[PDB]
Structures are given as structure tokens and as C-alpha cells.
Amino acid sequence: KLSEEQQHIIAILLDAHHKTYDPTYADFRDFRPPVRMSPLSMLPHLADLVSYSIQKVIGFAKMIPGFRDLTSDDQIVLLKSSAIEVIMLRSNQSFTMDDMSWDCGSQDYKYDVTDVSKAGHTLELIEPLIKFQVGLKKLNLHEEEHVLLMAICIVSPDRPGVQDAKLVEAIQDRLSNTLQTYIRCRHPPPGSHQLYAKMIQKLADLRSLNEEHSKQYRSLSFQPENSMKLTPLVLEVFGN
Amino acid sequence: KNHPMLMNLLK
Numbered sequence: 456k457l458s459e460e461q462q463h464i465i466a467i468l469l470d471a472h473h474k475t476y477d478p479t480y481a482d483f484r485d486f487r488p489p490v491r492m493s494p495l496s497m498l499p500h501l502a503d504l505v506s507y508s509i510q511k512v513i514g515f516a517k518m519i520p521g522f523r524d525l526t527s528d529d530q531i532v533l534l535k536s537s538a539i540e541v542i543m544l545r546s547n548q549s550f551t552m553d554d555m556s557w558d559c560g561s562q563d564y565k566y567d568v569t570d571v572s573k574a575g576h577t578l579e580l581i582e583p584l585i586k587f588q589v590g591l592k593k594l595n596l597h598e599e600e601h602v603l604l605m606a607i608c609i610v611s612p613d614r615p616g617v618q619d620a621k622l623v624e625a626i627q628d629r630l631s632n633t634l635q636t637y638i639r640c641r642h643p644p645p646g647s648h649q650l651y652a653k654m655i656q657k658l659a660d661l662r663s664l665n666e667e668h669s670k671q672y673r674s675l676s677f678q679p680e681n682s683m684k685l686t687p688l689v690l691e692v693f694g695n
Numbered sequence: 696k697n698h699p700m701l702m703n704l705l706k
């Protein structure tokens with residue numbers, strides 16, 4: 456019952472992901488160098504890393520079927536609210552339970568709790584973030600389910616500022632149904648058990664991580680000496 | 696809110 460159309464959607468989002476996630480992380484070398492001496496020693500590096508990631512998330516979103524049909528303003532609304540969430544999601548790919556860090560190849564480009572601390576966040580965010588990664592990792596999603604959950608996260612109707620909620624909801628539903636159907640036809644048990652509802656629960660976890668992230672970012676950025684160290688895009692998207 | 700850069704990457 457996985458339709459011709461739904462299979463097409465999966466193929467699109469998979470290719471879209473491949474075009475925007477370089478698993479060799481080669482570009483990381485353009486970033487300002489990480490410093491692990493350390494008053495926010497990691498902020499300039501992770502600033503570039505996140506700014507880079509925002510670019511890639513935008514590129515991914517633009518290839519989501521229906522996403523182009525939205526208004527300029529709704530696309531903007533969906534991206535600014537989801538960006539941090541989709542970065543957390545897509546980061547699962549580089550995250551290893553082997554030591555609960557994000558491992559982007561080299562040790563310089565391997566990032567752990569203290570690096571996140573040395574970028575200006577408290578355990579109020581870091582602990583639940585690591586918990587998120589752990590639980591998302593345990594789900595062992597097919598890459599098909601991974602790219603669908605990112606797309607579903609982006610096209611959420613209830614995001615603050617949405618104009619055409621009905622249109623946004625109609626796009627997400629097609630994606631949800633595609634996901635639900637993929638799991639039923641393509642994900643074998645025991646792994647498929649409750650999998651859709653578990654994935655959706657991760658979206659709720661993300662709203663909470665997003666809420667906490669905004670507060671802490673609002674505090675980090677509030678000081679010009681911090682905000683001075685970010686990138687123009689992070690400032691534009693996360694808040695200036 | 697005027698997002699030149701985001702707007703420009705969406706193009």
C-alpha cells in the first residue's frame with residue numbers, strides 16, 4: 456500500500472538529504488578553529504558549524520514536496536522555528552553512543568558535553584539534548600524514516616507565525632501518511648513496534664529542547680561581545 | 696521581520 460507517489464516522496468527526501476549532508480565533514484575546515492584550552496572557547500567554531508548547518512537545512516527544506524508552494528513568509532516562519540530542531544535531528548547521524556559525543560571524524564571535530572558547555576550552554580539543555588540523541592539513536596531509524604521526520608518537523612502547522620496553516624497541515628499530512636505507511640510496509644518487527652508514535656514523541660521532545668534553547672540563546676546573544684562572535688545568518692535566523 | 700539572507704537562500 457506504499458503508493459507510487461509515496462515512494463517518489465521518499466526518493467526525493469533521500470536525495471535531498473544526500474545533497475545536503477556531507478558525511479566526510481570536509482567543509483568543517485573552513486570554520487573558525489575550535490579552542491579547547493576557555494571562556495566560550497568553542498563559540499566561534501560552533502557558530503560557524505551551526506551557521507553551516509542552517510544553510511544545509513534550508514537547502515533540504517526547499518526540496519520537500521509542497522514546501523515551495525508555501526508563501527515566502529511561511530517558508531521563513533517554518534525555517535526559523537524548526538532550524539535548531541532539524542539541526543538536533545540531523546546531528547544524530549554524527550552522534551555516537553560509544554561516548555555520547557558528536558563525532559565528525561577528527562578529534563578536533565569531535566564535540567562533547569564540555570565543548571557544548573564551552574560554547575555557552577548549561578546542563579538544563581545539554582542533559583536533555585543528550586537524552587534525546589540517545590533515544591533517537593536507539594530507535595535505529597531507517598534513513599527513509601530519518602529524512603521523513605526531518606521534513607515533517609519542518610512543515611508543522613502550529614509553528615508560531617504561520618499564515619496558511621491549512622496548507623502547511625496538508626503538506627505535513629502527506630508526509631505523515633507516507634511515514635506511517637513506510638513503517639507498516641517496510642519496517643519489520645520488533646523495530647516497528649510503536650515506531651511512528653515514538654517518532655512523533657521525538658517531535659514533542661524537540662519543541663521542548665527548542666523552548667529551552669531559545670531562552671539560553673537569548674541570554675548568550677544578549678551581550679554584544681557574544682553576538683559579535685556569531686555569523687550574520689545565525690543572527691538573522693536564531694535572533695538578532 | 697526582514698531576512699535577506701534566509702530569503703536569498705530560499706530563492
Ligand SMILES: C=C1[C@H](O)CC(=C/C=C2\CCC[C@]3(C)[C@@H]([C@H](C)/C=C/[C@@H](O)[C@]45C[C@H]6C[C@H](C[C@H](C6)C4)C5)CC[C@@H]23)C[C@H]1O
Nearest residue numbers: 498501502505508542543545546549557566571574575672
Ligand atoms: C552536519 C552536522 C554534523 O552532525 C555536526 C552537527 C553537530 C551538532 C551539535 C553538536 C555540537 C552542539 C550543538 C550545535 C547543539 C547546541 C546545544 C546548540 C548551540 C547553539 O545554540 C549555538 C548558537 C550560537 C552561540 C553558541 C555557539 C554556536 C552559535 C551554537 C550556541 C545543537 C546540535 C549540536 C550538526 C549537523 O548539522
